[PDB]
Structure formats: structure tokens, C-alpha cells
Amino acid sequence: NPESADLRALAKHLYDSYIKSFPLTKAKARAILTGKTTDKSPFVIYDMNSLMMGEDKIKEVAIRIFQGCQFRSVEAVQEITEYAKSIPGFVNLDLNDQVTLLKYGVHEIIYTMLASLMNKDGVLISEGQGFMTREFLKSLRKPFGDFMEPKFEFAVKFNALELDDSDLAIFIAVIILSGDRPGLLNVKPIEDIQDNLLQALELQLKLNHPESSQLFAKLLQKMTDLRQIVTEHVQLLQVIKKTETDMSLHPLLQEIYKDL
Ligand SMILES: CC(C)(c1cc(Cl)c(O)c(Cl)c1)c1cc(Cl)c(O)c(Cl)c1
């Protein structure tokens, strides 16, 4: 199995860069989320009072929340970018294509990973020091009431796959190296890499979840739900910028969303 060996090694490599690039792994998240802890347990924000009291420990309000999420996104992009660099082959591509892959692949990954920080009842924030309930979010005045919902929706179905960090590291790699993205100057070197990634992913999922029939197909199919989330988000923003023309947007995100 020297063929296999090569892939395993690649899987191992991606996991490592993953752990090195992302401060809040699904493992830390699930530990805080469940209570393996007298030391990890989060402060919960579930209403306006606790919001005010959460602020005690570490604009408007619905807007203040939204811009916090937006800024975390910016921070998240930085992380993913550092991770991509580590994907064997990626930095060797046409610079323009590197930029194009990041442009499209970054949100998909954000939400995939955002799922690690959620369960049906809500989502970790402030690096896990806090926990905002799904219900508090819905309560936010339209249109912000609607922004975390579709994300929770995905995370619930997605989390059902029970992927761990090591499966995810390969999966976000497969996402970045997507050849079908618009305006790619040079697709084939991309497809060749992703073939390898896909091969690695496949192997990884059956070694690590052998009693889980067709998880690979099941997991590949989730990429439809991701683009939907992304699309709605972008629709949501098109609207916000017209109702709240006093609310800013981070130029980086502005650039990612442009012509998306
Ligand atoms: C709310 C949440 C989960 C988030 C993150 C991203 Cl990246 C995102 O794009 C969206 Cl809409 C929501 C978040 C917010 C903060 Cl302030 C934080 O420190 C952490 Cl660890 C997580």
C-alpha cells in the first residue's frame, strides 16, 4: 500500500496545518459545548440583559452583534488563507487563480467550520468564552433576525455526519481546490490537486468512520447546502447596505462578495 501511504501522509499533513492555522477546533468546541469542564464552560447570552451582562465579562445592538460576526469573518479569512498556503501545490498556482480560489472558497469553509461551534440551541462566540442562543438571534429585529438561521439549519444536518477535525481538514482542502470556480485562468492543475485531496478524503473517511456507509458521497453532497447558505447571505447583505447606509462593511469582505 505505498499509494495509500502517500495519501495517509497527506491527510496527516493537512490535519497538522489545520491544527496550526485554526485556534478553535471542533474538539475544543465540543468539549466546551458538552461540559467536560468546570474550567471551559461558557457565559451564555440569551436575552438583552445577559447581553449587557456578558459585556461585563469581555452603535445599536442587533448591529453591534452583526458587525462582531463580520469581523470574526475577516479574522477567519486570514486563518483559512494561512491554511491554504499549506495545501501542497496551492502556492505554485497562478497567483490570480490563488486569489480566485480564496475568493469563492472562503465563505463555504467558514460556515462548514462554524458548524463545529454550534448545536441546535445556539453557538459559541468570543473564542468560546461565550455562547449565544439561536433564539436570541431570531429575536433580533428584521432583517437581522434572519441571518444566523440558515447557518444553524446547515450545522444541524451537517453535524449529523459527526466529522472530526482530521476529516474536516481534508474536506476544507477539497473545497478550496475547486476547479469549477469562475474566471479560473488555469483549471487542470487545480483538478489534479483536488483529485488527490478527494482521494485522501475518501480513504480518511473509511479508515476513520468504517461503519458509516457512503459518508464520502454524503459529505460531498453537502456542498449544495453550503452554496445556498452563501447565496442567501449575499442576498441578505445586498439588502442591509440599502436600509442601513450608515453601517460600514470591511473592505476585505466587500472584495470577496463583489461579483460573487
Ligand atoms: C457568531 C460567530 C459564531 C460567527 C463567526 C463567523 Cl466567522 C461568522 O461569519 C458569523 Cl456570521 C458568526 C462568532 C462570533 C464571534 Cl465574535 C466569535 O468570537 C466567534 Cl469564535 C464566533
Numbering used by the authors: 205 to 262, 275 to 476
What did the original publication write about this model?
Recently, Somm et al. (2009) showed that perinatal exposure to BPA altered early adipogenesis in the rat, which is mediated by peroxisome proliferator–activated receptor γ (PPARγ), a nuclear hormone receptor whose dysregulation is involved in the onset of diabetes and obesity. We provide the first experimental evidence that flame retardants TBBPA and TCBPA are ligands and partial agonists of human PPARγ and also activate the corresponding zebrafish and Xenopus receptors. PPARγ displays a large LBP that extends from the C-terminal helix H12 to the β-sheet S1/S2 so that halogenated BPA occupies a small portion of the LBP. Full agonists of PPARγ (e.g., rosiglitazone) have been reported to fully activate their cognate receptor by directly interacting with and stabilizing helix H12, whereas compounds that do not directly contact H12 behave as weak or partial agonists by stabilizing other regions of the LBD, including H3 and the β-sheet S1/S2.
The closely related tetrachlorobisphenol A (TCBPA) is also used as a flame retardant, but in much lower quantities than TBBPA (< 10 000 tons/year), and its presence in environmental samples has been unequivocally demonstrated. TCBPA was soaked into a PPARγ apo-crystal by adding 0.5 µL TCBPA at a concentration of 1 mM suspended in well solution directly to the crystal drop. The crystals were soaked for 4 days. We collected diffraction data at the ID14-1 beamline at 2.55 Å and 2.70 Å resolution for TBBPA-PPARγ and TCBPA-PPARγ complexes, respectively, using an ADSC Quantum Q210 CCD detector at the European Synchrotron Radiation facility (ESRF, Grenoble, France). Omission of Fo-Fc difference maps for the TBBPA and TCBPA structures revealed clear density for the ligands that could be positioned unambiguously into the PPARγ ligand-binding pocket (LBP). Whereas rosiglitazone occupies a region of the LBP spanning H11/H12 to the β-sheet S1/S2, TBBPA and TCBPA occupy only the region between H3 and the β-sheet S1/S2, with cycle A nestled between H3 and the β-sheet. The half maximal inhibitory concentration (IC50) values for rosiglitazone, TBBPA, and TCBPA were 12.0 nM, 0.7 μM, and 6.0 μM, respectively.
